[PDB]
Every structure is written in structure tokens, then in C-alpha cells.
Amino acid sequence: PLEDQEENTLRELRLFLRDVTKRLATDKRFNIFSKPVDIEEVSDYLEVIKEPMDLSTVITKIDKHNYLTAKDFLKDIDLICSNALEYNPDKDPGDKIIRHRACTLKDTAHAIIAAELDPEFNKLCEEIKEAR
Amino acid sequence: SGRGKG
Lengths: 132, 6
Known about the structure:
The complex is a heterodimer of chains A (about 130) and B (about 5). Chain A is an all-alpha fold. Chain A has one domain. Chain A contains six helices and no strands. The longest helix of chain A has 24 residues, at about 95-115. Chain A is elongated, with a radius of gyration of 16 Å. The chains are: A mainly alpha (about 130), B little secondary structure (about 5). Chain A: It is found in: Nucleus. Chain A: This is ATPase family AAA domain-containing protein 2B. Chain A: It comes from Homo sapiens.
């Protein structure tokens, strides 16, 4: 029914985003991004990083209906990668691995969205998001 | 940047 179109579209989007996020969170390369940085083990993390983000929080935000478009979702993936580059110094090999992995996460997420979402469906999501 | 995680 036409009156159910908005809800049906967003449900489809959320299902897709939840699948994408699960694919990222279970990828061994991105394990360090799968849960919030432990603010007690990394005692200076919140001093440096104003808006923490991680893949488990992205799942929650999907379920809280925070994302109306794939671009909305990608902003938080980009934040996860941005946080890693802002926080971690480029000193030791462990730092370099995390920083590289953050960029790989970003590239991988953007590539999945570009490959698996119909541009026409995205216009529909934008139209819905533009009506609210 | 912070101290890092190493």
C-alpha cells in the first residue's frame, strides 16, 4: 500500500545497513572498531576524542532509527575512521596498524554501499529524509 | 593525538 511505502523503504534500508555492519564487525581486520574504545584502558581517549563511535554503537543507532540514508550511516563509519586517525599517533608499529586498518574500514564500507545499494533506492531514501 | 594503545 502506498501509505506504507516510507516505512517499507526504511525497513529495507535498516536491514541492509545491519547486514553491512555485521559484515564489518565480524571481519578480523576491524575487530578493534567493533566495540567502544575502553576508556579505562586508554585513559586519555576521551580527552582527545569528542565523539566516540564504533560498530556496536552503529548497530544500536540503526535500531534507534538514527539513519534514514546510507549517507547518514557512512557519516558514522567515517567518524570511526576519523577518530582512529585523530587519536592514534604515528609512532610505533601497533599505531600504524590501527591507523591503516581504520582507513581500510572506511574504504571497505564505502565500497559495499556503492556496490550493493541501487542509486534509485537511495533517491527514495533521500526523498523520505527530505520530507521530515 | 593521544599516547596510543601500545
